[PDB]
Design a protein around this ligand. Sequence first.
Ligand SMILES: Cc1cnc(Cl)c2c1[nH]c1ccc3cc(O)ccc3c12
Length: 330
Amino acid sequence: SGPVPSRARVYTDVNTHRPREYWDYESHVVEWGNQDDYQLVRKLGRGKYSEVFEAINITNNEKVVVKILKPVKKKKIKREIKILENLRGGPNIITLADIVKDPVSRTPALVFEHVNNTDFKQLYQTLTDYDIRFYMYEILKALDYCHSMGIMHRDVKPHNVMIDHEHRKLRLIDWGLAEFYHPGQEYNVRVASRYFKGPELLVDYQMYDYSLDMWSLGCMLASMIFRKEPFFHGHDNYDQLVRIAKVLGTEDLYDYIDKYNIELDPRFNDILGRHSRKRWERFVHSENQHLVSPEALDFLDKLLRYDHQSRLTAREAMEHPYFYTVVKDQ
Ligand SMILES: Cc1cnc(Cl)c2c1[nH]c1ccc3cc(O)ccc3c12
């Protein structure tokens, strides 16, 4: 057999000890609420699998968000519902408030708590150094919680982090790509958005884990402190790896793939080239230098590693000196 196997270094056996029904989402029996409780007000967006609306709950008069599914890959339906139910109440995880049958589409409609957020292209230009540290800690709370519950998000991106800046409140949304981690399981590499895909995805390595989410958060951090959106700006999936290699170097890339006995797609032969690892100071200039510190760079350096096993875990990340200046609640 070809590729060397891999395991999460934390929360490894979390699912294997749980009752079968916790992770066996296929068997879950959906509890339906009352569709007439809700009234659609404004369409907020169309995803790949769904349509999203601001609504209002008529029974309590409170604002709500309704995601109406478009079932073509029907398995993801029971998977997402079970994941949000398992995670409900956790820190900075969006609350699934109800599940109703939509009379028009005839499909499930997830009803979430309302969060009033601002556009990230507008918001990621405003964040002071202090505020980057604050919100990063808040994200980590969300990620450690779901990782501890045996769940990987697999789509961390600025779009999926809803932020109420006036109230300094944060929520991690869109659990449509989320999955239960089972040691030794082979996963689909076709997940996450292009700029936020970890090296494991890009080299076709299927036995990945929670550490996928940490590469992603790494990409977000780099874009914030350096003011460069996105940080790794690929034309496509292949060039995306080339973009990573121009920063982290090709020798460490070859070391990664060699450790796991993986073969790069031969398409890379004529496009990858030879690149040294860059020092993080090369991305610093007079416009972003107020967002950068020794601690910020060390922290970043420990998130953005090729080897998914060498990345900081969420809990270790919360232990980093980067977070010392941040006041905790309470
Ligand atoms: C594409 C997509 C998928 N899933 C969710 Cl929950 C959302 C989404 N877009 C939005 C936009 C605003 C939202 C506000 C919420 O309070 C909760 C979820 C969303 C969502």
